[PDB]
Amino acid sequence: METLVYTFLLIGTLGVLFFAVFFRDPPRIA
Amino acid sequence: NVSVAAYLAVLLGTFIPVVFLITLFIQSEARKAAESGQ
Amino acid sequence: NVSVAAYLAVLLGTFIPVVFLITLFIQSEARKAAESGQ
Amino acid sequence: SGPNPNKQPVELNRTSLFWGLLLIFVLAVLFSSYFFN
Amino acid sequence: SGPNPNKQPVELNRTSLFWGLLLIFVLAVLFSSYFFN
Amino acid sequence: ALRTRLGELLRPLNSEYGKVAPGWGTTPIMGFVMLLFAVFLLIILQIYNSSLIIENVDVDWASLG
Amino acid sequence: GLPWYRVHTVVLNDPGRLIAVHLMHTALVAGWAGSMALYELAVFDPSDPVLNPMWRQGMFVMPFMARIGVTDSWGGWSITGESVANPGFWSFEGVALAHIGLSGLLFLAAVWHWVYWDLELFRDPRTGNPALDLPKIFGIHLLLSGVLCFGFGAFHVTGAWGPGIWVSDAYGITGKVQPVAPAWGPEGFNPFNPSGVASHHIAAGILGFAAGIFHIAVRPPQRLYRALRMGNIETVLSSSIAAVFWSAFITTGTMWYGSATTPIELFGPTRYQWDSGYFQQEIERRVENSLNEGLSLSEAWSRIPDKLAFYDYVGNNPAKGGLFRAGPMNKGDGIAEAWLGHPIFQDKEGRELTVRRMPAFFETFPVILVDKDGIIRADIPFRRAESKYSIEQVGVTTSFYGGKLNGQVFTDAPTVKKYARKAQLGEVMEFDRTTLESDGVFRSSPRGWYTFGHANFALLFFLGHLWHGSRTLFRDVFSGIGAEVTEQVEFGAFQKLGDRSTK
Amino acid sequence: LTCAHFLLGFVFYIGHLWHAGRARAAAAGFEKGINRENEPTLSLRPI
Amino acid sequence: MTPSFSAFINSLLAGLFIVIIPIGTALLIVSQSDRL
Amino acid sequence: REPVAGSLLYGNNIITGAVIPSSASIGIHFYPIWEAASLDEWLYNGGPYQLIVDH
Amino acid sequence: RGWFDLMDDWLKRDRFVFVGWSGLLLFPTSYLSIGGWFTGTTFVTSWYTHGLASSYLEGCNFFTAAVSTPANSMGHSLLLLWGPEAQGDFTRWCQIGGLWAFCALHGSFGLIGFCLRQFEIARLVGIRPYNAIAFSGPIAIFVSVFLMYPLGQASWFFAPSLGVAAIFRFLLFIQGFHNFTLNPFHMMGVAGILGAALLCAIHGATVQNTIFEDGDAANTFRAFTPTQAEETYSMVTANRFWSQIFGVAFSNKRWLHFFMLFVPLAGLWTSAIGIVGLALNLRAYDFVSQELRAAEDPEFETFYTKNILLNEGIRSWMAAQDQPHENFIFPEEVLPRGNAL
Amino acid sequence: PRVYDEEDQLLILSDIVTFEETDLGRRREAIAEASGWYTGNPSFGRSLIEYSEQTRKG
Amino acid sequence: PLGISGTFNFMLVFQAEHNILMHPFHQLGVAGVFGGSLFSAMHGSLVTSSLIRETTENESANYGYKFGQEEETYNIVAAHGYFGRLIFQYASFNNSRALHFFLGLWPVVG
Ligand code: CLA
Ligand code: CLA
Ligand code: CLA
Ligand SMILES: C=Cc1c(C)c2cc3nc(c4c5[nH]c(cc6nc(cc1[nH]2)C(C)=C6CC)c(C)c5C(=O)[C@@H]4C(=O)OC)[C@@H](CCC(=O)OC/C=C(\C)CCC[C@H](C)CCC[C@H](C)CCCC(C)C)[C@@H]3C
Ligand SMILES: CCCCCCCCCCCCCCCC(=O)OC[C@H](COP(=O)(O)OC[C@@H](O)CO)OC(=O)CCCCCCCCCCCCCCC
Ligand SMILES: CC1=CCCC(C)(C)[C@H]1/C=C/C(C)=C/C=C/C(C)=C/C=C/C=C(C)/C=C/C=C(C)/C=C/C1=C(C)CCCC1(C)C
Ligand SMILES: CC1=CCCC(C)(C)[C@H]1/C=C/C(C)=C/C=C/C(C)=C/C=C/C=C(C)/C=C/C=C(C)/C=C/C1=C(C)CCCC1(C)C
Ligand SMILES: [Fe+2]
């Protein structure tokens, strides 16, 4: 059952990376 | 075999800071949207 | 007497709606404070 | 893309927050005995 | 009582949110094996 | 600012904010007491460290009885 | 707006809400104390005080309750094992309920102080802005702390108007809460003298009372007021954090090395008692004394108490646990039921053989049997290795004196090597592992857990002392440096560094 | 022989990368830095 | 009285008269001499 | 013929989990999927390690 | 002015080497620690404490010479030269390892003095004191490894000896007896150190490769002058490059430099927490589930179990000579081996 | 038995160091404006209070 | 091995077979990574210490820097003076480009 938790944590980290890359705050010149 | 407390600790120590950060970010974005034109 | 799954069910089904409601209320109060004079 | 005209703010009252917290805690109290069986 | 002059707004950036989520998930991945032992 | 019985009772204790003594005040006395405290700390540290034996003082569990 | 890591700085300049948040933290701490005591009471088993003590059951706050008087319980039992008819209110349950009620009252007070923050007491009479006269507040609170210290030392500890403190013998066999008279000589300064605690608290309380009188009456020098930034609360925070981690290091050292304030019957043995064979030497001395009085070996080993033999067991060593080996020591090596007795190994010739004790350093230690001279006679091979000194080959036979197995002799190799493996851990004990589903890896005593937690806390608070001291000593430059810094930073053209008047 | 010439092959791959990159930059004309008058990334639209 | 405490007192005296007093005296003399 | 487990489903956590290197019988021979008799044989000899390393 | 003011003026004078008030603690303590280390590695032996030769006089080189820790017979003694162990005898004090205690104590006070020096120079210059907070990392490393770990152990003997090969021994000894690689705090420390090296290299390359063409010379080091009101490299170009190459990029220079500060400091503090945990043998040595699985299944093997066997071999084959005070005598039959398994 | 320090000690200097803009910076700004580097997300790189104050008055 | 414990096993077996700790090139690599950490911390401390005040006390100092700004966010002269007073005056990287070149060079060479 702990394998499910490990896989869930890894997939969550990968999704966090995906959202950080493709949904970041867009830089602009101020 | 594996303790109940171990799963409880992992899941809660993951979720509680995560929901705290999400709540703080949503509050900040709400302030930004309210102050700006909408 | 049930395993870790029952404790996880109780704790998560309590906390997740609670943190959702708290986040929504904090967002609403943030909008109210931002729109009002502060 | 562009500015979406359908965006609307979402508000939750303090009364609504307390109603929700009370409902969630009461449901947890009711169903905890059955989940623990 | 009355209006408190020390009230200050609190802001969290999207960068800060992602940094926090990454830190929490990475710490969970690291310490899950030890908590499960 | 609310006025209360306990607030006016304790008000003189929180009245002389920023009031200071003239130059260097009682600093030599403070330094001397700090030196004595440092000597005392060295004595007690060397006592348990066993680097210092005074008399009839046995830093050991067997001294309990 | 404020970042997430500066939010509580809103109560930096508001004394009322600072008092409110401090009241909230005290309420949380008291509530944790009460809840932890209640949980420990729900877990604790007072059935076997000698072979299943509090430190074998993972009790953390119960030893601190028992240190200064609270030993009875409303369930009709005591830590010492002596049944009590009228326990009194101040049992463990009573203390826990009192702490919980105090937590609730402090929460209500925190709510009131947060709501009613604007009081004339918190505002300076000379200037309408709120302020705190930190030297006078320090004097008042120092006088309060001195009064409390003197009262604890003179009344509670000495038993004049108190229960006393926990005092045990040199080997933790007969210990209980008793009054102690102060020791004003040099003998009051070794850590292993309970009288030193009473004398210390009395004298330090008197000195603190005098110091509080002084710090109330006398205003600080202008030099110290400007140097230490005494008008700023953050320098008080930094100095308090410094003293706090100093005290944390001292308490960590006293817990790990042992003291009269860390009894063996409440926190378990120290690692240095196993390193020096503190209990083994006493057991051998008692056996030798009994043998000198004409008693036989079986009688001599039967006079050894079970508690003293249980102290000479490496499973009770605080330096045998693990960082993520959670739970009580009973969860680790089972619950101890009875002492099996001292084993003695003899080869075919008849030479006395002793199994070398496992050092706390080794996770796995080889099983070695040596004679009185010191030569290796028998050993258990590693896993599946060729041997010339195997127990099955040397014909080692073990005989138990004292305990359950008194008078029993074993001859076959498997039971002899099993008993040798159990004896390499110290005194051989019988454990049951079914009530808690024990795994078999040693846990840590509450002494070791306290030492670990408070050592890490002391290091992190040294970091906090550095950060907050830097913050209060550099408040003018917190937002950043200006345009005047580039001139004073230029090499040369300034006789004194950071002095505009010079050159 | 093997260690020496493997090390030489690696360091000369490094040298090839360095000299090829600099040859490309010098032929294009920005091996001395960014012009700061017509910056290439300032003409590109963001994202 | 023990040799250990005599050594401790002599160590305090040596730290005062060999480290603290000479360095402090030299620092004071040089600071007073060079007012710049 | 004594395999070493490194997968989560075979009793490993994150710390102890690994992609085991190729079999010593393979050596440094090129071992793609099509050079193994069966997919089970390819998995048994540490072929995925070579695939991951090369790619 | 008063005597204190004149001394403060003299200590604050702009000389080639700044002295300051913190210098009165830093210079003597650091000088004595360094000189004692040189004296120990040059003349002082370890024959009566470790049964080892560690000095140039005995024939050691730079790698094998060390100031070895005191004998295990001494507890956590301060080992004062006038203390009861040495009783004023310099030769016996050096033979029992008292020079290690000398170096360690005067070096800890030298680190404190250097931290105070950073604070004082930051105050006098007029800048924020983010130094002496970065140095808190090395201070915590030294305190946890050279002070807290031996204090938690039996004696000063198990502290690291001040030498190259001695430090390597300490690494292997800790790995064998604690499985410190498996410790998550050590993992966070390794991540912090490697990430700090990565940040240093990547930031240097990024700045060097995004400079503005501020000079006509091919060598671009001359194009910068310290009295510049303009940035010497393009932050926008660097942000675009790393955002389209890696997917994310820094946009704030202040956040970038604070991050480059934060990563090694956090790594060092986490490793210090791990070493403090090791000080009481409270180690993440083993996984209970894996041990139970291997006990009931001889065909179950993972790299963790191989690491456990390697640590057992390290302990068994180094105990006899690494801890000569224990008088360990292990027959060849009980020494673990791969064939013996 | 038979003077006040009058120093705030809670004061940040809080003086903004203004930087002037030259013709080169103006040309870079115009080139960036032509490419849309100033439109899109206006709240990027600005704190909540700074963005609030700039939105309150123009 | 492509893992954590496998990596530790690789390190231990490599140290056993080859004694990498006594190899001068692994010593150079250790010097490289330690120097990289030290130099990253030092550069971050010096830049953060000399940040020019462009912000108020109620907000983060990072907002004092604006993305795309043409001015320098920190005083190089102040950091250089602090570094040249922490050690002797000669040891200091007055040139920012040379300092960043050294920052790139040291861990890469290690
Ligand atoms: C009426 C007040 C009161 C009383 C009688 C008790 C009584 C008790 N508490 Mg509770 N507690 C209280 C208030 C009280 N508490 C409050 C307000 C809090 C919230 C902060 C707590 C939080 C708390 C916790 C978290 C725990 C207890 C515990 C305990 C028990 C052990 C006490 C002990 O060992 O302290 C030891 C205390 C010390 C060693 C501190 C000494 C003071 C230091 C040295 C002062 C240093 C600075 C000083 C100012 C310098 C003086 C200078 C000098 C010159 C004078 C005991 C039954 C423990 C227990 O058994 O659990 C229930 C426990 O774990 N209490
Ligand atoms: C000074 C603090 C302190 C100390 C020394 C102890 C000591 C003890 N407690 Mg108590 N406890 C404390 C605070 C403390 N407690 C607090 C604050 C709580 C409330 C949550 C509890 C609640 C509690 C319970 C409910 C129980 C104990 C038990 C115990 C015992 C064994 C604990 C153990 O094995 O640790 C195991 C510790 C770990 C496995 C991990 C410790 C944390 C490490 C260092 C890592 C944490 C940081 C890391 C980054 C987290 C990652 C998060 C990630 C998922 C995002 C021991 C006597 C047990 C016992 O036997 O009592 C009867 C028990 O059942 N404690
Ligand atoms: C008596 C102790 C004490 C007190 C009153 C303060 C008070 C303060 N600190 Mg200091 N600090 C302390 C100890 C203390 N600190 C220690 C020990 C450290 C070392 C780790 C620090 C390191 C530190 C830094 C680096 C900074 C502060 C800052 C601050 C201010 C705001 C804190 C804030 O909003 O956090 C908000 C915190 C959160 C929103 C969540 C934090 C949760 C943490 C990470 C883990 C959870 C802890 C857990 C719930 C309870 C811990 C148990 C306890 C026994 C420790 C405030 C003036 C900040 C400031 O304003 O200065 C400019 C700042 O930058 N402090
Ligand atoms: C092994 C690696 C390592 C070494 C050798 C090292 C060394 C140094 N770094 C310093 C600074 C710093 N270190 C920093 C960050 C870091 N430094 C790191 C790792 C290291 N730092 C890491 C990982 C970081 C990231 C957080 C910063 C931010 C600074 C500084 O500000 C400062 C500096 O200016 O550097 C540019 C200097 C401190 C001078 C001092 O204390 O006063 C004099 C020296 C004293 C008091 C030490 C003597 C006593 C020592 C502790 C014991 C004796 C040791 C013997 C003499 C030698 C033994 C040799 C064997 C062990 C082989 C010194 C050159
Ligand atoms: C082809 C691309 C291939 C790689 C794609 C993924 C790489 C990019 C990852 C982005 C997320 C990381 C940053 C999050 C947080 C985030 O959104 O950062 C955003 C941040 C930019 O922030 P700003 O400079 O705008 O912040 C200004 C400040 O005022 C804000 O406080 O970027 C960085 O700081 C540098 C990132 C360092 C790189 C960190 C890498 C971490 C890798 C962790 C991997 C874990 C793997 C686990 C596997 C089980
Ligand atoms: C309100 C009130 C008014 C009147 C009526 C009333 C009902 C009688 C009364 C109520 C009174 C009551 C009910 C009062 C009771 C109040 C209570 C239950 C307070 C609980 C406190 C728990 C704490 C502080 C735990 C903290 C854990 C920490 C810090 C982290 C720990 C750890 C974790 C897991 C994370 C990692 C770190 C470590 C250390 C490992
Ligand atoms: C060739 C080579 C290659 C690579 C580059 C390279 C490294 C630069 C170079 C090396 C060159 C070399 C070889 C450089 C080496 C240079 C050397 C050997 C310098 C030795 C200095 C000795 C000192 C400072 C001892 C002072 C004694 C003191 C303070 C006494 C202390 C005392 C103690 C014992 C304790 C009691 C009290 C007192 C009395 C205080
Ligand atoms: Fe830079």
Under 8 Å between Cβ of K142 and K114: no
CA–CA distance, K326 with K72 (Å, rounded to integer): 9
Ligand sitting nearest the alpha carbon of G243: 1
Q: Whose CA is nearest to atom 10 of ligand 6?
A: G104
DSSP 8-class letter at A25: P
Number of other residues whose CB lies within 10 A of the CB of residue G28:
14
Under 8 Å between Cβ of K157 and K292: no
Facing G189 at nearest CB: one of F20, F22, F44: F44
Q: Which residues pair with G397 in a beta bridge?
A: G346
**Per residue, what are the HEC states of G15-45?**
HHHHHHHHHHHHHHHHHHHHHHHHHHHHHCC
3-state class percentages of chain C: helix first, strand second, coil last, to nearest 5: 85, 0, 15
Of G440, G430, G390, G434, which is closest to residue G413 (Cα–Cα)?
G390
Cα of A20 from ligand 5 centre, angstroms: 7
Under 8 Å between Cβ of G331 and G438: yes
CA G277-G278-G283 angle, to 5 degrees, is 90
Q: Which residues of K touch M98 (CB under 8 A)?
A: 221, 224
Residue G3 gets the label, from left (phi > 0), alpha (psi -120 to 50) or beta, of beta
Number of other residues whose CB lies within 10 A of the CB of residue J34:
6
Q: Whose CA is nearest to atom 9 of ligand 6?
A: G104
CA–CA distance, K258 with M65 (Å, rounded to integer): 13
CA distances from K88 to F39, J5, K97, M30 (A): 21, 61, 14, 40
Number of other residues whose CB lies within 10 A of the CB of residue G52:
20
Number of other residues whose CB lies within 10 A of the CB of residue G350:
8
CA–CA distance, G312 with G315 (Å, rounded to integer): 9
Of K197, K217, K219, K195, which is closest to residue K208 (Cα–Cα)?
K219
Sequence-separated (6 or more) residues with CB below 8 Å from residue L42 = A28, B36, L51
CA–CA distance, M38 with L21 (Å, rounded to integer): 36
CA–CA distance, D33 with G358 (Å, rounded to integer): 49
CA–CA distance, G167 with G178 (Å, rounded to integer): 7
CA–CA distance, K272 with K256 (Å, rounded to integer): 25
Q: In E, what residues contact A, Cβ < 8 A?
A: 13-15, 18, 21-22, 25-26, 28-29, 32-33, 36
CA–CA distance, K236 with K257 (Å, rounded to integer): 16
For residue G445, give the ligand 2 atom closest to its CA.
57
CA distances from K198 to K23, M106, M109 (A): 34, 11, 12
Encoded amino acid at K120, one letter: E
Largest CA distance in chain C: 55
CA–CA distance, C6 with K204 (Å, rounded to integer): 53
Select from G8, G232, G454 the residue to mutate for testing ligand 3; criterion: most ligand atoms less than 8 Å from CB: G8
Q: Which two tokens stand for residue G481?
A: 């440096």
Helices (H), G293-387: 297-302, 306-311, 329-333
H16 annotated as ligand-binding = no
CA–CA distance, K280 with G360 (Å, rounded to integer): 10
Of G96, G100, G119, G88, which is closest to residue G42 (Cα–Cα)?
G96
K126, closest residue in chain G (CA to CA): G485
Of M6, G292, D12, which is closest to residue J7 (Cα–Cα)?
M6
Task: Assign G93 to helix, strand or coil.
Answer: helix
Ligand 4, CB within 6 Å, residue ranges: K 30, 33-34, 37, 103, 107, 110-111, 114, 118, 131, 134-135, 137-138, 142, 162-164, 167, 264-265, 268; M 34, 37-38, 41-42, 45, 86-87
Encoded amino acid at K240, one letter: R
Q: Check H38 against L31: CB less than 8 A apart.
A: yes
Q: Containing H/E element for G337?
A: strand G335-339
Q: Which two tokens stand for residue G365?
A: 């230690």
Which contacts (CB < 8 Å, 24+ apart) does range G178-184 have?
Answer: G182/G153, G182/G158
- Does the C-beta of K250 come closer than 6 Å to ligand 5? yes
CA–CA distance, G426 with G423 (Å, rounded to integer): 5
Which contacts (CB < 8 Å, 24+ apart) does range G372-376 have?
Answer: G374/K327, G376/K329, G376/K331
Q: Containing H/E element for G379?
A: strand G376-379
Which contacts (CB < 8 Å, 24+ apart) does range M86-91 have?
Answer: M86/K18, M86/K117, M86/K118, M86/K121, M86/K131, M88/K16, M88/K17, M89/G491, M89/K16
CA–CA distance, G465 with K131 (Å, rounded to integer): 15
Chain H closest CA to L23's CA: distance in Å?
Answer: 11
Task: Assign J36 to helix, strand or coil.
Answer: coil
CA–CA distance, G400 with G419 (Å, rounded to integer): 10
CA–CA distance, M62 with L36 (Å, rounded to integer): 24
Residue F44 touches chain K, beta carbons under 8 Å: no
Q: Which two tokens stand for residue K277?
A: 């945990």
What does DSSP say about strands G165-167 and G176-178: parallel, antiparallel, or unpaired?
antiparallel
DSSP 8-class letter at G53: -
Under 8 Å between Cβ of K22 and K111: no
Task: Give the length of chain A.
Answer: 30
Of G217, G12, G129, which is closest to residue F19 (Cα–Cα)?
G217
Q: Containing H/E element for K55?
A: none
CA–CA distance, K320 with K328 (Å, rounded to integer): 5
What phi and psi, each to the nearest 5 degrees, are found at residue E19?
Answer: -60, -45
Q: Which two tokens stand for residue F61?
A: 């569990």
CA–CA distance, G226 with G217 (Å, rounded to integer): 20
Ligand sitting nearest the alpha carbon of K280: 2
Q: Is the dihedral of CA A12, A17, A20, A21 positive or negative?
A: negative
Facing K220 at nearest CB: one of H32, H41, H42: H32
Q: Which two tokens stand for residue F49?
A: 């460290």
DSSP 8-class letter at M62: G
C-alpha atoms less than 13 angstroms from C-alpha of M65 in its C-beta half-sphere: 25
CA distances from G211 to G148, G154, G155 (A): 14, 19, 21
- Does the C-beta of G263 come closer than 6 Å to ligand 6? no
Cα-to-chain-centroid distance, residue G146: 24
Which contacts (CB < 8 Å, 24+ apart) does range G197-200 have?
Answer: G197/G153, G197/G157, G197/G165, G197/G260, G197/G261, G198/G153, G198/G154, G198/G157, G198/G158, G198/G165, G199/G153, G200/G153
Q: Whose CA is nearest to atom 49 of ligand 2?
A: E27
C-alpha atoms less than 13 angstroms from C-alpha of J5 in its C-beta half-sphere: 17
Cβ-based burial of D10 (10 A; exposed 0-12, middle 13-18, buried ≥19) = exposed
Binding residues of G: 8, 22, 25, 67, 99, 141, 189, 200-201, 215, 454, 465, 467-468
Q: Whose CA is nearest to atom 38 of ligand 3?
A: G5
Q: Which two tokens stand for residue G371?
A: 């004679």
* CA quadruple M38, M42, M45, M50: dihedral, nearest 10: -170
Of G315, G309, G316, which is closest to residue G284 (Cα–Cα)?
G309
Q: Which two tokens stand for residue A22?
A: 């493709």
CA–CA distance, B19 with B8 (Å, rounded to integer): 16
User: Given the structure tokens 């050596």, which residue do they identify?
Assistant: J27
- DSSP letters spanning chain H: -HHHHHHHHHHHHHHHHHHHHHHHHHHHT-TT-B-SSS-HHHHSPP-
- DSSP letters spanning G110-165: HHHHHHS--BGGGB-SSSSSB---HHHHHHHHHHHHHHHHHHIIIIIITSSSS--E
User: Given the structure tokens 């799963």, which residue do they identify?
Assistant: B7
Q: Check L10 against G478: CB less than 8 A apart.
A: no
CA distances from K213 to H38, K204, K222 (A): 11, 17, 11
- How determined? cryo-EM
What phi and psi, each to the nearest 5 degrees, are found at residue M56?
Answer: -100, 170
Q: Which two tokens stand for residue G154?
A: 């003179």
CA–CA distance, G392 with G399 (Å, rounded to integer): 16
Encoded amino acid at K159, one letter: A
Of C14, C12, C3, which is closest to residue D30 (Cα–Cα)?
C14
Q: Is the dihedral of CA K179, K183, K185, K190 positive or negative?
A: positive
Binding residues of M for a quinone: 43, 92-93
CA–CA distance, K186 with K273 (Å, rounded to integer): 8
CA–CA distance, G252 with G452 (Å, rounded to integer): 8
Q: Is the dihedral of CA M90, M92, M97, M102 positive or negative?
A: positive
What phi and psi, each to the nearest 5 degrees, are found at residue G385?
Answer: -105, 150
- For chain A, the first-to-last Cα distance in angstroms comes to 50
Residue F21 gets the label, from left (phi > 0), alpha (psi -120 to 50) or beta, of beta
Under 8 Å between Cβ of G424 and G365: yes
DSSP 8-class letter at A24: P
Angle of helix E14-36 relative to helix A2-22, nearest 10 degrees? 160
Q: Which two tokens stand for residue G242?
A: 């410094």
CA–CA distance, M106 with M109 (Å, rounded to integer): 5
What phi and psi, each to the nearest 5 degrees, are found at residue H7?
Answer: -60, -40
CA distances from G139 to B31, G210, G402, K132 (A): 45, 10, 62, 32
Chain D touches chain C, with at least 3 Cβ pairs below 8 Å, answer: yes
Q: Containing H/E element for M9?
A: helix M5-18
CA A13-A16-A17 angle, to 5 degrees, is 90
Which contacts (CB < 8 Å, 24+ apart) does range M26-29 have?
Answer: M28/M109, M28/M110, M29/M110
Task: Give the length of chain J.
Answer: 55
Sequence-separated (6 or more) residues with CB below 8 Å from residue G314 = G274, G320, G357, G358, G360, G425, G426, G442
Q: Which two tokens stand for residue C19?
A: 């943190």
CA–CA distance, G287 with G281 (Å, rounded to integer): 10
Cα of K111 from ligand 7 centre, angstroms: 19
- DSSP letters spanning M44-70: HHHHHHTBB--S-TTS-GGGGS-TT-S
Under 8 Å between Cβ of K310 and M8: no
Residue J12 touches chain E, beta carbons under 8 Å: no
Task: Assign B28 to helix, strand or coil.
Answer: helix
Cα of G488 from ligand 8 centre, angstroms: 23
Angle of helix E14-36 relative to helix B4-35, nearest 10 degrees? 180
Of G283, G329, G317, which is closest to residue G439 (Cα–Cα)?
G329
Give the start-end residues of each E strand in G156-303: 165-167, 176-178
Under 8 Å between Cβ of K78 and K57: no
Q: Which two tokens stand for residue G139?
A: 């004097």
Ligand sitting nearest the alpha carbon of M73: 8
Under 8 Å between Cβ of M6 and J20: yes
Of G332, G235, G311, which is closest to residue G267 (Cα–Cα)?
G311
Cα-to-chain-centroid distance, residue K168: 12
* CA quadruple K242, K245, K247, K253: dihedral, nearest 10: 0
Residue among A4, A13, A28 with most chain E CBs within 10 A, to mutate? A13
Of F59, K65, K14, which is closest to residue G260 (Cα–Cα)?
F59
Residue K228 touches chain L, beta carbons under 8 Å: no
Q: Check A20 against K248: CB less than 8 A apart.
A: yes
Under 8 Å between Cβ of G348 and G395: yes
User: Given the structure tokens 């030479």, which residue do they identify?
Assistant: G351
CA–CA distance, K121 with K112 (Å, rounded to integer): 14
Q: Which two tokens stand for residue G27?
A: 């309420």
- DSSP letters spanning K131-159: TTTSTHHHHHHHIIIIIIHHHHSSSGGGS
User: Given the structure tokens 């105050």, which residue do they identify?
Assistant: K123
Q: Which two tokens stand for residue B11?
A: 């899941």
What does DSSP say about strands M2-3 and G409-410: parallel, antiparallel, or unpaired?
unpaired
Q: Which two tokens stand for residue A2?
A: 């702990």
Under 8 Å between Cβ of K106 and K35: no
Q: Which residues pair with M51 in a beta bridge?
A: M74
Q: Resolution in A, one decimal?
A: 2.6
Q: Check G223 against F23: CB less than 8 A apart.
A: yes
Q: Check A27 against K243: CB less than 8 A apart.
A: yes
